[PDB]
Design a protein around this ligand. Structure first.
Ligand SMILES: *Cc1ccc(S(=O)(=O)N(C)C)cc1
Ligand SMILES: *Cc1ccc(S(=O)(=O)N(C)C)cc1
Ligand SMILES: [Ca+2]
Ligand SMILES: [Ca+2]
Ligand SMILES: [Cl-]
Ligand SMILES: [Cl-]
Ligand SMILES: [Cl-]
Ligand SMILES: [Cl-]
Lengths: 9, 227, 227, 9
């Protein structure tokens, strides 16, 4: 189950 | 980072992201927050990306070590899992401290307030992932409370396709499934979120449509795994 | 790490590798070295893997920042490149200090002495990659001297297919090409190394054959790029 | 040009 990756920007 | 200019901290956070130096990124953005001014939309994203990467590495390591520890059941595996766990908890506490002093109380616009409250839910959720003692339930309720306040504001103040609103609902649904032992609530939230976004897509430009449909795919991916 | 048992440090270094916590790995193996006993073959590999990963991340970041800095030609890009550069130099100095106090002087067997001297050549080579001032030439000669001593021992004491002998020649050839501005020496060394290994493969077991041919492929990959 | 990766084991 995936949360928002949120690791780029 | 008290002797560095706010703008220099922001510029170096962007450089650290390019160099994949996320611990540096986080320290630069911690310094920028502690300058005491509010953060722009771009700056909030830098803060979030930095700490998501740092805690993401810690969570991945903790899961490796917890798995090894459970299979083994000397003190070394437990000791080292505890070390990583303590470092992860310190990062979460640091982020929660930034939100509490004083990002959230100065966030008056919906986009900033929902963004920070989602953050608050996320980092309590990471604390809940490793919690086992007398405060597991209290940490879970702290996560739920933050997500719920963010949900209430986003439903009143944002369109159903707003990427922050969608990412908030996505993560709250993961909270329900993974932390709160409420898979039916998780599935219901993800389905209703997806369906209300789909019905609002007609209002969007090509670029906004791409932003929203990307996160709707993540909701769909979870529903596919959960059902 | 003076209060932790040597065996616990080794066990935790292995756990940190599994968790991809290479800074922890390196600190654990630094503590193990400073216990003052010699290192086994496996322990030498743990030491090497840990610091290769740490400095590898620093080198990758330094190249990103150096590229941005060269394109730009405020002080921020240079300042941050200098910070990363200083941290990289400190890691190299730490490794070189471990070799000098006292890994190399206690290494009497060919496998251990060549391993450490190759290490010494590698970390001077990393210092040379970022060097620009009065000591660039002296750092390059320090790298060359370490590699050369390792070469001399390996040619006398190891078979041409020995993986340490092959990896040493591979890295010394990269030193010649990338650092010493001697591409013909690099190509000659890689070719002669490959050809003498190929002629010795018949002596090897299936598993040793796999170990050696893997590194011979790296030599071939470089020759393909250089010719 | 590649040195030995040396980052696993
Ligand atoms: C929590 C969260 C929601 C949405 C995004 S985004 O990539 O779509 N964006 C920065 C608006 C990131 C994180
Ligand atoms: C420098 C170096 C040479 C060879 C290797 S190996 O992977 O073949 N091995 C650990 C013997 C690693 C590093
Ligand atoms: Ca100022
Ligand atoms: Ca002891
Ligand atoms: Cl530990
Ligand atoms: Cl405000
Ligand atoms: Cl800096
Ligand atoms: Cl000895």
């Amino acid at each position: 189950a995936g949360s928002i990756p949120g690791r780029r920007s | 980072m008290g002797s560095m200019e706010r703008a220099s901290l922001i510029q170096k956070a962007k450089l650290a992201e390019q160099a994949e130096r996320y611990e540096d990124m986080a320290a630069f953005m911690k310094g920028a927050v502690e300058k005491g001014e509010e953060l722009s939309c771009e700056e909030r994203n830098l803060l979030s990306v930095a700490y998501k990467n740092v805690v993401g590495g810690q969570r991945a390591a903790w899961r490796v070590l917890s798995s090894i520890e459970q299979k083994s059941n000397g003190p070394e595996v437990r000791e080292y899992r505890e070390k990583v766990e303590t470092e992860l908890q310190g990062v979460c506490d640091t982020v929660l401290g930034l939100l509490d002093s004083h990002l959230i109380k100065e966030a008056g616009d919906a986009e900033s307030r929902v963004f920070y409250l989602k953050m608050k839910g996320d980092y309590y959720r990471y604390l809940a992932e490793v919690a086992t003692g007398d405060d597991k339930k209290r940490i879970i309720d702290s996560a739920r409370s933050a997500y719920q306040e963010a949900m209430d504001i986003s439903k009143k103040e944002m369109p159903p396709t707003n990427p922050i609103r969608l990412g908030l609902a996505l993560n709250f649904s993961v909270f329900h499934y993974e932390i709160a032992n409420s898979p039916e609530e998780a599935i219901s939230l993800a389905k209703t979120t997806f369906d209300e976004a789909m019905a609002d897509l007609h209002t969007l430009s090509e670029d906004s449509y791409k932003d929203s449909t990307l996160i709707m795919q993540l909701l769909r991916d979870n529903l596919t795994l959960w059902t």
